[PDB]
Amino acid sequence: RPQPDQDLSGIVGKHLIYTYANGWQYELYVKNENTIDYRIHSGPVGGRWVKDQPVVIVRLGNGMYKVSWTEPTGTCVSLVVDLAERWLHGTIFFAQWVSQHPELTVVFQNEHLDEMRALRDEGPVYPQVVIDEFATITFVENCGIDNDDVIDCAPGELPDGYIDRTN
Amino acid sequence: PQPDQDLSGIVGKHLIYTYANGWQYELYVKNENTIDYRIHSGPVGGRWVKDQPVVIVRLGNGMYKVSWTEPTGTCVSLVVDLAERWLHGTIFFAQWVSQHPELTVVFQNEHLDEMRALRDEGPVYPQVVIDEFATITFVENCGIDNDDVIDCAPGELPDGYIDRTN
């Protein structure tokens, strides 16, 4: 009864666009074994985007990966990504203050890390608000490792049909 | 093409598992959205919980995700593979739990207010994150809403209970 092989070559370099069952459109790029960039297009935190988010990735089975991390806002995330079947499951544990004021996290976070930690330390943190939703993966491409051009602007500054592309 | 969300393959399941760091945990899926659990070893060995609200989804054949938050502020997301007898755990705990794990070693149901006081006191940040694979050493079906599966402290169990295999 072996635990699955931990080769991550099937996930690193992957760039995906996905729509949660509640309509929220998210974007992910797996920069390397332990780093992602992401960009949020709609829902309460549409406009939020992040580079060089440290992440822990494990392989669950064929084309199936788990991606988990914590954010400077205090938010915790664990994703299950099925590339083969083109779906994803997201658990987002956000702090109470992020639930109350999602607008305050709508930034290029890399230019505002101190502000995020100030809002986090101010709270309130508890109780945490939990989102569990399935998403459809509408788009997948391979952009290779450590490519800083994949996610390099606010979602508002992209062409209008960028988020709507399919394969 | 998202997977069918029939949870009958996970509800009623009772499992004992050992993380790669040797920590022995025990889980009972009481119903679609509730677990009891009992921790036997590692920093919070002695801790046990009844009627933990939980969100469960089916990922594939014999593969389930179980996620919840605790009155301590701890967040948990498990991937359970019953077919291949392994489990992957992500545990996000507050700085104060990392510093004083002994303070969470209780029958939590009799100490909910104390846990929330310790949580609101902090410190909270940075969070400490555990990602570990576990081997599932034992599985049985105990059916739905069975309050007898996990009804005492791990210290009060028969000596061979956590060592059984199948």
Author numbering:
A (entry chain B): 24 to 190
B (entry chain A): 25 to 190
Paper text:
Enzymatic decarboxylation of biobased hydroxycinnamic acids gives access to phenolic styrenes for adhesive production. To date, several PADs have been biochemically analyzed and structurally characterized. PADs adopt the lipocalin fold, and the core of the protein is formed by two mutually perpendicular β-sheets. In solution, a homodimer is formed by two monomers that are related by an improper 2-fold axis. In this study, we used ancestral sequence reconstruction to generate thermostable decarboxylases.
To gain a better understanding based on their activity and stability, we determined the structures of N31, N55, and N134 via X-ray crystallography. The models for the remaining ancestors were predicted using AlphaFold 2.41 N31, N55, and N134 were crystallized with one, two, and three homodimers in the asymmetric unit at a resolution of 3.1, 1.6, and 2.5 Å, respectively. For a given PAD, the monomers were found to be highly similar to a root-mean-square deviation (RMSD) of below 0.3 if aligned. Also, the overall structures of the PADs were found to be conserved, leading to an RMSD below 1 Å if aligned to BsPAD. The highest structural divergence was found in the C- and N-terminal regions. The C-terminal part (depicted in red) shows some structural and sequential diversity. N55 and N134 harbor an N-terminal loop (depicted in blue) absent in N31 and BsPAD that contributes to some extent to the dimerization (compare also Figure S4). All ancestors showed a highly conserved active site architecture with identical catalytic machinery.
